[PDB]
Curated annotation (Swiss-Prot), chain D:
Precursor of the fusion protein processed in the biosynthesis of the S protein and the formation of virus particle. Mediates fusion of the virion and cellular membranes by functioning as a class I viral fusion protein. Contains two viral fusion peptides that are unmasked after cleavage. The S2/S2' cleavage occurs during virus entry at the cell membrane by host TMPRSS2 or during endocytosis by host CSTL. Disulfide bonds join 11-33, 16-22. This is Spike protein S2. It comes from the Viruses. The gene is S. It comes from Severe acute respiratory syndrome coronavirus 2 (2019-nCoV).
Amino acid sequence: FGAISSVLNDILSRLDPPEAEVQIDRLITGRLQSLQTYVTQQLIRAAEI
Amino acid sequence: ALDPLSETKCTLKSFTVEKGIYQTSNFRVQPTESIVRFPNITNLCPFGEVFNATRFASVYAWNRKRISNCVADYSVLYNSASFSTFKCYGVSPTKLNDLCFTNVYADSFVIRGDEVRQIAPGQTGVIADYNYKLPDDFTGCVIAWNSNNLDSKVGGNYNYLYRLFRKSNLKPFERDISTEIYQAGSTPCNGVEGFNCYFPLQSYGFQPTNGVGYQPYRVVVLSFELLHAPATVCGPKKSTNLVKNKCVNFNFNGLTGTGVLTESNKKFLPFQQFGRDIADTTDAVRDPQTLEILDITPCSFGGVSVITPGTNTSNQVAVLYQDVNCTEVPVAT
Amino acid sequence: DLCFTNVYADSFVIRGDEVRQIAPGQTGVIADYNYKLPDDFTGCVIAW
Amino acid sequence: PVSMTKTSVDCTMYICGDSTECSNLLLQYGSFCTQLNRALTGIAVEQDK
Amino acid sequence: QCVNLTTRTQLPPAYTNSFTRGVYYPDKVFRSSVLHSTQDLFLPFFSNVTWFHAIHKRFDNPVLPFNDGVYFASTEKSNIIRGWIFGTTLDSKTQSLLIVNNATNVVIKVCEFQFCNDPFLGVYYHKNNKSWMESEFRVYSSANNCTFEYVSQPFLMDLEGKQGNFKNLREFVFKNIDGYFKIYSKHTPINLVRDLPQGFSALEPLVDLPIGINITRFQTLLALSSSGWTAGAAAYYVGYLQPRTFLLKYNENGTITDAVDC
Amino acid sequence: KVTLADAGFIKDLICAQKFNGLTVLPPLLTDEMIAQ
């Protein structure tokens, strides 16, 4: 999602948290948005069933 | 955190709970102990062979030394006060004491004082366009400090020199040796010298009573690459013993994680070191002291639901541990 | 034109070119052995 | 067709897998995961119905 | 020292097809039973590649351009291929790479060399002692500055062999990325005569070098008084790489088994 | 005729789905009460 790596334990063990907040925020945004897309699609399929 | 009934209250944000079953927060086996595995590298790194060199190369002929197969300590160079600036980019200098690297490159040269701003990656200017360029995803550190007393002479040690004129910009980690003459005019020039036929190199006026911003500074760059190779140069951490089938914290060459290490059937080819999942999580890892392949599985977890009648009736509850044999509940977040 | 509960004034003397290290979030000699500022610092740093 | 498979998602294991700093940054986003858990619970009840 | 050998037939070059060749392991990360999409330089399938050969008469070692890496192969008996040259101007202005896989050692040098018209190797032919012993090392005359050197262990490979149908089948990929000269290889016994084998094989990562130079040309070293000589029957194939997305298949055993030129 | 999947029993892609917060709740009605 635009950060330097996709593994969270990489970022925790490479930076100290005052700038690791920037990377982790990008990951949180990306994963939360993907999860929201999934639950919306499952809602529509539930209505059809 | 007292009992499941208060847990149900907490997640519904009410003092009252109605009849039914509610799914709640989940459980997890805690890791019990910590395991650190590092290779058997013993000897120390020749930093003084870089920093206490008698001669430093010119910036257009910058010297690179490849440091490998030694156990460094970056704190002992880190906490010295003599450095004018110590700025890193791919990492932060606190973690450098316990992260292990596969090969380290040390670049050294000399520069005029007020263009250390131009040694930073992503900037442009004179030095960044004709003498030394860093790539934009640079992962390392830049150390710089003035050395006016040792190299600058009152006559002027003019063997330090740099390129002025150049045909084009050069790529990262490119270096040119060239005595060709340059044509700043439109007309081509041949032979040696003429009108607007320029020799591309020029020497600094390094003389010691010069003002600041003209001072000679020594610049050292460390440009290690990260965590994807059989490593050589680690940080000074001592190794622990190897524990299997317990929830542990493992630290394999800087790979940090929590789980259970197990004997594997995964028959690695020898040039490999690691192993990933679909979801990009490490699951198979090679111990750097015994060449065996260890499977990594995170510990047990699962669903916790609470069954209650109404609190108007009574305050006794019951628990459903979802999708597990019963026996993991006695050891148990 | 704000108002504050109490104001804390810290004073000392350092070597001149480590005033970069008095900034919060940085590390180095002064930031690790003599004076450390927290990351969510509010206030001002004046140096001359 | 009559029903579909009852699926449940847990955020804090999905998004911030076994990190404390990640979850402490996550509670700044409020109560999204309560809504997502609520929606999947609604679907899971509706299947049995 | 060298001798200008011209005792040979002149022929037009041969063009062949690169059917299902030119893929390697993209990094050293183990994966299993999965399909994986990647982007790197690869050799496109069914592309036009060049066939060179030495028989009996025929001995052709031209200097060829080096862009974006090379897919090399060679089918051979009697172990005639031994060395390779790489560089950009080759006349003592830029450093050059030399590899010699002769009978004794594996000698890899990165030196400021100076070659001539016809740099090559050679052995005498079966002079009643049942042996082809080394007699011709006429490659370079000067070496000014040399950064990397390596001589491997001494050994003794076989320097004889007579089959009209070649069995030794060597495949290599050479690449220069980040000043890093990357050697991928495979060897196969094959029942083949005069062409490329129809089939597929993964190219394992073997060797990395931190040379840091720019190479635009190369030359190949094959084994052989001044004229009057015998060259062993062998062929080799040259092809050129291209940045193309691929889809790769990892089996249970973590072997790259199948590929999609996308 | 119908090939189902993802049983997900405690100890595949199903195991990988299990190790990331994705769980499958079993149905309320079994396969015999429906037949009854």
